[model samples]
Target: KMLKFEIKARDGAGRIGKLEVNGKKIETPAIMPVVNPKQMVVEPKELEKMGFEIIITNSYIIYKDEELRRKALELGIHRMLDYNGIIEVDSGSFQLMKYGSIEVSNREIIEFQHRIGVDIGTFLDIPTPPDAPREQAVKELEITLSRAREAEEIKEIPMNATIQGSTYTDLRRYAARRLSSMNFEIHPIGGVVPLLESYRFRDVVDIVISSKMALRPDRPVHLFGAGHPIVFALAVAMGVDLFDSASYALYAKDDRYMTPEGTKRLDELDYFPCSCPVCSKYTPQELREMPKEERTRLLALHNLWVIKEEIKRVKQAIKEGELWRLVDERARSHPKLYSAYKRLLEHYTFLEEFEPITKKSALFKISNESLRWPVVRRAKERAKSINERFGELVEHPIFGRVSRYLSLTYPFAQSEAEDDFKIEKPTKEDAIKYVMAIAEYQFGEGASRAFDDAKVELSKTGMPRQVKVNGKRLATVRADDGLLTLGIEGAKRLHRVLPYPRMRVVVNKEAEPFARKGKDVFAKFVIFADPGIRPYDEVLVVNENDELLATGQALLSGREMIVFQYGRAVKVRKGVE
Candidate 1:
C-alpha cells in the first residue's frame, strides 16, 4: 500500500504508469539519473527544473562519511540535496561488488536509508556476478532474498526488492516470484550490469523476460544500472518500468559521448552529431579544448538530455500503441540488439498476451523482426484455420503464391447470379494481394469470400481502396499500408463469422442502454471480456444477454478492466442497437 502503480497506456509488455510514494508521484516508464553526493554533475535543483521528478543516490556513501551522514539526517535527503524532488537511496550493494564487502550491516543500511527520509530505499542485496556457478549463484540469491525479506519487515519507507540471479533465467524467475511475494513496492532486476557491458544482450533479454513473467503485475519493475538510452526502448518493451542512470556522468568523466544509438569517443569525433543545448553551443573541437571537469559536466548534461528525449518518445509510442514499431526501429541500430530482438519472437505467445489488438499508426514492416511479431504470427495461424471451401482452384507457376491467391479468390464463391463478377486486370494484381492479406490479417481466412460478388474500387496506384457488397459500403482499406477500417456491415459480418468472443467486451444490463447509444464503457460497468482483448483492440461491446450493443475499441486489457475501478474501458465507434 506504500506504492501505487496505475497503468495509463501499454504496448506489448511495456506500459506508461504512475508510481506514487507518500505524497509525491513519478510517471513511469521513467528514468532516474544517478547523482553522486560527493560530486554533482548537474545540481539536483537544475535537474528538477529540467523536468526530473525523481533522482537516485547512494545512501551507503553518505553513511560512510560522518559529515555527509550528519548533513543528510539533519536536513533530510531533499533539503540536503537542495532539490525537493523524490530521492531514491540505494544500499551498499554496488559497493559490495566493487570492494568485495561493505562495512555496514544490511539491517543498518536499511535503517539508515529510512531515517534519511528517502522516498524509495533499496536493501543491501548480494550482487551475483554473471559468471557465478549455479551453486554459488543460488547461494547468493538465497542470501539476497533473505536480506530483502528482513528489510521488508523493518522498512519504514517504500523500498525496492532487488531480484538477483546472475545469468540463470530459472534463478531469476525464482528470485522474482519469491521477492514479489514479500510485498515490496518496486522490483528491480539487479546484478546484470556485466552482461550489459559485454553486449550479451540476448542473455539480458532472457533474464528480464523470465523475471518479468513471474513478478506481480501490479508493481513497477526497475532495471538497475541501465543508464544508456540505446537499450531504453528494448527494456521498456519488455515491461521494465524504471531505469536508473549513472552512465551519464560515468561515461562523461571517461571522455565518452552518448547518443541514443550508441556511445562515441570524444577523440574520434570530427563533428558533433547532436543538437543538444551543450552541443549546439560548442563544436567537437571546442569541447575537447575545454577544461576536463567542465567538458565532463557538459557531456553528462547532453547525455541526460538524450536519455530524457528517448523516454519521452517511448511514452508517446505507448500511448499511440506504436511502441513495438518504435522498438523495432531502435533494434535496427545495432546488429547485436537486433539479434537480441529476434530472440524475443521465441516468447511471442507470452508477449502477445500483453500486446494491443490495434494501433493508431500504420504497421510498418521494416525488418524481418516485424514479420516475426506476435500479431503477424497470430494472423497467419488464424488465416490458415478458416475453412478452405473454394472449388477447382487454379494452379500457377509459383505454388505458394498461387495457392494464397486461389484461397482468396475462390473461398466459398457467391451464388451463380453473382458468379459473373469479373476479375480486375493484371495492373491491380499487387493491390489484390495487399487487400487479401490485410483482410485475412484483420478478419481471418475466408474474409476475402465477402469480396466475391463485391465491387472493389482502386486508388490511383491500383490498390483496393473500398469494397462494397450490393452497393452498400463494407470496408475501406488504406492504399499505403493495407489497413482495413471496418464499416458496420463488415463488423457485423466479421462478428458473426469469426469465432465467438475473439475481441468482445460484455457489459452489464445497467450499462447496455448507454452502450447502445454509442457511449464509452467504463471499467466498473464491464461484466466480462475476452481474455485476448488488449488495449486499442477493436471490440464488440455486448450486453449480459450477449446482444451486441456497440462496436468499439478497447482501452484496457481484460485483466485491467476487471482490476481497475475507474477510467474508460472502451471507446465506442457506433451503436449496434
Candidate 2:
C-alpha cells in the first residue's frame, strides 16, 4: 500500500491520526498549504522548515506547462519542487470548475501524476457547483464516478476520489458510498469552495455530514479548499481529517488576516488581536505600510502559525476528551458558525457514535446545546430505561422519602410541593440505589450485581460520596452531581463478574505491567475490549490472563481503540501494582 491511515484519537467524528505516504508519516488532522510553483509566495522548502510534512499543488497546471511537466518528470516531483516531504497533486478538478473545463482527459491527468512520483494524487472528477441544479449534479456525479473507475485501473500511486454532489445531500451520500467501495485510498469532498466563498457554512456542514455518514470508516476524509482556522474545529469534529487551502496566501494577498476566532481585513483593524510571532514583531500599521509582497508573505506565515496552533489545540482536546468543549467554544465566536453547528446537532445520532462516554472534567450543563450532546442524551435515555424496568412506582414526598425502587429513580423525580424531593441528605439506601443505577447504565445490565451489599458513605450535604466493599474503598460519588466514579478495587470487583462485551478492555502481558502501574492504555497495547464500551465509561483493564491490571475511564470505543494506531485507549486512575 502506498498509504496507511489510522485514527489515533477522535472528538466526535474529528480525529487525530497518522497518515503514512510511502513510509513517511504526517500527523492529522493536518492542513496542507496549497503551493503553486509558478506563482510561488512561499517556498516549499520553507514550508517544510515550518514543520509541514505535506503540501499540495495543481497537477493540471504542471501538465498544462510542457516545460514544467518535463522538468518535474526528469527531476521527480519531490526534488523539482525542492520538497522532500509528501506531495499531493490535484488533477485540476478545481481548474475544470473554475474555467468551465480543462483540455486534458481524466486518465491523462492520472497518468501524469503517477509518472511524477506524487505521494498522493487526485482524479479529474467533476466538481458540481454549489448552485448547480439537481439534474446537473446527478449528471456530474455519474461522470465523476466513471472517471474514478478509470483512474482506479491505471493509478500506481495512492489516489483521492473527490466526492462531489453540489448541494444535494442524497447525491453526496450516493457518491460517498460508491466511492468508498472503490480502490481510492482517500476521499475528498470537492466543490464546496463556492459555498465557503459565499459564507454558506451551514450547507457545508450538511454536505460534509451527508458524505461522512457514508464514507468508509478506515480511510481519511479530506475537505478540499477548507483551511480557515475558525472552521477547523467544527470540520474536524465532523470527521474531516485533511484540509487543503490556498486561503493563507489567497486571503493574505487581499490584505486579510486569519485567526482561529475569525478573519479580519488589515485596513479595518485598529490593533492586531493576534499574539503570534508576526503580531508580536509587527503592529497593524507596520504590516499595512510594508511592501505588498513582504506583507502578504508575513500574513501568510502568520496564517500558517494560527492554523498549526489550532490543530495542536484540537489534538490536545481529543486527548483530554474536551473536543466538544472546544467545538462549543468555537461555535460561539460566529453566529453563522454556531448556526451551522446547531444544524450539526440535528445529526446527533451520527455524531454521537464517535463521542466518548466520559471526560476528565465534570459535566457542566452550560447551555441548551450542552443538553443536546449524545452523552447527555444517552444518560437521559438510560435513566428512562431504568425507570421503565420499575414494576410499580410509589411516589415519595420530600419528607416521606421511604420508597425503595422509586428513590433510586432520582433522575425522573417530579415535584408536587413548593420544594421538590431533592436528595439533600442521602441515606445508605439512597446511596446504594444511586450507585446501582450508575453501574447498570455505565458498565452494563449486570454490572451492579456485586455492589448489592456494598456499604456507602454520605457527605455532610447528604449525597452519596463513597462506596466500599468489605472495608476497601471501591468508588467515590461526585458531590456536585450523584455520578459514580470508581477506584481500582471497584473496577476489579466489577471485572470479576461483568459479562463479556461490557466496559472491559484486555491487554497483552507486554502491557500488563505498565497498566498495573497506572499508565494509560495506548491504542497499540489494547488487545480487545467490549464493543459496547464508550468513551468515559469506567473500564476494567485486564491482561490476557483475565487478571485485572487497573481501572480507568475509556477515551475511545472498543473498535476505535483496536483500530487506532496511537493515542490513549483509557485514562488510568488506579492500578493494582
Candidate 3:
C-alpha cells in the first residue's frame, strides 16, 4: 500500500534520513519536544527559532478545552500554532496511563486528529504495568490492536502504531512484528517506562531489541515515553527512528534541568553547564531570583536544547557511519547500560559476527582498552565479515585501530580529537605502508618487496617518502629494478599479515603495484560489492594520484589473471575506459 523505505546513510546499523509522509516529509532519526500551550514555558516561536522542525502536543488536553477544541476543528492544527512545521499528536495514552481508561474512543480520537490537521496521529492503548500478568498484557494488546484497526478504518490521519508489552520480551517482539505486518506509518514501542525508571534497563534494552527484530528495517520505530538524552545513543543504535517527550515540561515545572548525562534538581540551587540562550544569558542565581513562571520557561528551553543536541549527535553519527559506536561509549560510562549491552552481544550472536568484540572480560575492567572495546569489537567484526565474504589478506592493525577509534570518538570527542584521527580516505602512505606489511603476512616476501619498491617510486611522484607504522616513521627506499630494502628490525612484523586480508593501499602512481606483491591478486573482484575491495582481495584498479593501478585481486598467484578472467571474470576491472 506504500512505497518501500530507503536507507540514505548509516553508522553501522544505526541511521538517519527522511521518509515521505503522504505528500509531506519527516526527517529522521529525530526527536520531538512536547509543546505546552498553557504554561508556555518555551513558546512555539522560540522552539522554531531554535531550529526545531517537529513538536508534539497532547490532543486530549486540547480536546478537554471546549473553546480550544472548537477552534482546532475550525482553523485546523496549523493555524492553531500559527506556524508551518510538522505536528504529531498523542492519543491521550499517557492520560489513560496516569488516570486509567480514557474517555474518548479510537474512532473519535482519529476523527478529531484528521479534522484538526494532525500529520501523524497515535492510537490510544492500555498502559499495563510491568507487574501485570501475561494474560492481562495480551488482553491489553488485543484491545490496542482493535483500536489500531479502528483508527485506520475511521480516520485519514497517518497513524502511529503503539506496541504495548510492559517489560516482557516476547510481548514486545510480538507487538512490533504484528504492527509491522500491517500498514502503520510508524511503530512505537510502548509500556516500558517503568523499566526505564526502575533501571531494569536490560529489560528495556531487550524490549527494544526484540521489537526491532520483529519490525521492518525501513519504517521508523519510535520509543514511546522514553526521551532522556542519556538513552538516545542506545535507542538510536538499536534502530529507533523518532522520539517525543514532555520531560522538558515536567522537569521545568519541578525546577529541574536536564543534561546529556542526567537530570539535576534545580531547587538544590547549584549551578550547571548549559549554552541555551536562556542559560547563557542568565545564571542559576538569576533564574532563582526570577518569577517562578520565568524560571520554568528558561529551564524548559535548556532541556529542549539538550534534547535537540542529542538528536543532532545521532543524526551526525548516521552520516559518518558510527551510530553504535556512540551507543557503546555511553554504555561503558553507565554500568547499567553496559550490563544491558552485554545481552545484545550474547543474544544476537550475529551482531558480534558483524562487529566482533575481541575481549569480553576486558570490557568490564576500567581502562582505555575497555573504554574502546565496543567500537574495536565492531570494527573487527566488519573486517572479519569482509574477509569471510571474499578472502583473507594482510591485516592493517594500526590503521584499522585508528580508523575505528576516530569513528567511535566522533560523537563525544572534541573537534581537535576528530581532526587528529582523520586518516585520508583512499588512505595515506603512512597507513598504506602498514598495509604493505599486513600484505606480507597474507601473501609473502614477493608482496612485501613489490609494495615497498612501489612506495619509493611513488615518493618521486609526490607520495610521502617516509611512512609511519604504529607511530614510527620507517626509512624509505627507492625500488632498484623492483627490489627495495628495509632494516631487519623494521621487517620483523612485516611477515605477520598471514592471518588477516583487510589491508589498506596508498596509490599515487604505478600499475597493480600492490597486486604484483600478491600471489593471487585478481581473485574475487566484484563491482559495487559491499564492504568494498582491499589490498589482497580482487580490485578493479585504475590510475590517478589516488586511483587504481590495475584490475585484479590484491595478489598474483599462478595464472591468477587467466583464472580470474575465465572463471568469475574479475567482477570489476581497471582499464583504459
Candidate 4:
C-alpha cells in the first residue's frame, strides 16, 4: 500500500501534519526511534507513551538470524514487539559498512520486510563509507538503483528509496534526480554515520539539502540512521519528516551521556541541566557506581529524554514561524557544521532568514554571491506562500469580550468598539499588548501570591497566558503550565499608566486595599494569574459603577467562582464598615 501525505498545516518554510499508511497515520515531522528486539532497550508499551507512534527495525538482521527470522515471519513484526504503531524495516546497510561486503540478496531482503507486517521498508542499498572515492561511491549508488527497481516490484508495503552519494555534490544531485524520478513514497539520504560521529557534517548537510531540493513536495523525506538532538531541529526545518536512530542504545552501552549538543563521557564531572526523572534524580557519577548493565539502562533513559526534548523544540520552532532561524543557530554551534550549512544555503540561494549562530571567537561570514539558480527562485516562491498563510490557525475569542466590556461601560465605548470590535482581527501589536497585560495582572505583587507561586513552583506547566476578560480556568493545572491573564483593561485604563509600555507584562494581580476596604478606593487589582483561580484568594471583579474594577487575592484558590473573574487574582477580604 502507498503512504499518503496531506498538507494540513503550514508556517513559513515549516509544517505540522501527518501521513497515512494502511489504517494507521503517523504525525509528520516525527521521530521514528529504532527498536531492535534483540537489544530490547525499552519495551514497546513504554515507547508508545513517549510519543513514538511509529518505529523502524532491521529486516536484514532478522533475515541473518534464522530462528529470529522464522518467528518474525510467523507472528508478524507488530506482534513480536507487542506494538500497535506502524513499523518500517531497514535493509541492513550498516552491515555492508561494517563487514565491507554483505551477502544478502536485495530481492530476498525486500520480500522479507514485505511478508512481515512492515508498513514501510527500505531497499538494500550499498552504503558508501565517508572515505569511498567518487567513482566507487557512484558505483555503489548504481547498485542501489538496481536493487531499488527489484525491491519496487516485490514490495507489498510502501518503500523508502535510499540515496547514497558519499559526500560528492554531482553524485548527490544524481541520486536526488534518479531516486525522486522513481517516485517512491519516501526517500532517505543514507550513509552518514561516519559524518555524524566525526562531525564532518558538511557532507551530511550536503546530501540532505540536495535531496530535499529535488525530492517531490507531496512525499515525505526520511533520514536513515541519524538522530541526535543537536542536529534534529535543522534537519526537520529543512523538511525531513521521518528518521530512525540507535544512538540512544549505543551511547548508553558506551558509558557516554547523550545530549543535544554532543555526547559526553560519564567521567567528566559537571551538573546536568535536564529535568528528566533520570537526570534530575541521579548524577552521572551515581550511575557509574552501578554495574555496567545497570548503567546502560539509566543512560538509555537519559538518551530517550534528550530525543523527546529535541522533537518538542522542533515543533515549537515550526509553530513560532521561525524554524529556519533555529536551524541557522544550530549550524553555527560548530564550525564544521556551519561550513556545510553555508554551502547548502548558497546553493539553494536563500540568503535571508538563515542566520548562523556564530560568536566573535568563531564567526561565519558568507561572501559567495554566485549567480542565482532555478531552485533558489522556486524556494522563494515557496517561502512566499508559507509566509502568507502562517499563524492563520483560528485564535481564541477573549479579546473581543474585553472590547465588549468597554462598549457597555462608557460613551467612548461605541467609538472604541467601532474602531476594533473584532478580537480575531488583532494586528501583531494588539496581540502583544493583549498578552502582556494579561500576564502582568496575573503574576505580580500580592499577599496571596505564595499559594499560586507554590503551585507553579511544584507542578509542570503547559498553557501560556490567555488574555481573557471573562474566561474560566481549566480543571487541572500545574507549575509547568503558563498563565493566560490580562493586559490593558481599556483605553482610559491605559491613560492611568500613560506611556508605560502597553501590554508589556501579563499577570492577574489582586487588589492591595488602602485600608481594610469598604469597596476599593482605587482600581485595586491583582496581577498575572492563571485561569484556574480558587475562591477568596485574589480576584479581579467589576464594581457597582461598572466602569470601576478591583484586584485582590482570593480567600480560596479552588474553582468555585464567587464573583466574575474573581479567582486567584482576587481575595474577598470584605469591605470595611
The lDDT for every candidate, in the order shown, is: 0.76, 0.79, 0.57, 0.56
Q: In terms of lDDT, which candidate is strongest?
A: 2
Off by over 4 Å in 3: 1-5, 321-325, 332-334, 344-577
Give per-model TM-scores: 0.79, 0.81, 0.66, 0.61
Task: Point out the higher-scoring one by TM-score: 3 or 4.
Answer: 3
Report model 2's TM-score to 2 decimal places.
0.81
lDDT order, best first, reads: 2, 1, 3, 4
Clashes by residue pair, model 2? 357-535, 358-535, 358-536, 425-462, 426-462
Best by TM-score: 2
| Model 1 / residue 77 / CA error / Å | 0.7
Give one digit per residue, the lDDT tens place, for model 3 in 164-230. Answer: 8777778887888778777777788888777776666677778888887677655678887777888
Q: Report how far residue 512 has shifted in candidate 3, in Å.
A: 31
Q: What RMSD, rounded to one decimal, does every model reach?
A: 6.6, 5.8, 11.7, 18.6
lDDT for model 3, please: 0.57
Candidate 4 lDDT over residue span 355-418, tens digit each: 1111111111122211122222332343233223232422112122233111111111111211
**Deviation (Å) of 574 in candidate 3:** 10
Compared to the true structure, candidate 4 yields what TM-score? 0.61
Which residue segments of model 1 deviate by more than 4 Å?
A: 317-322, 386-528, 540-551, 560-568, 572-577
lDDT of 1 at 239: 92
Candidate 2, residues 14-132, lDDT tens digits: the string is 77888888888989999999998789888999999999988999998998898888899998889899999989988777878888799988878888887888999888788889878
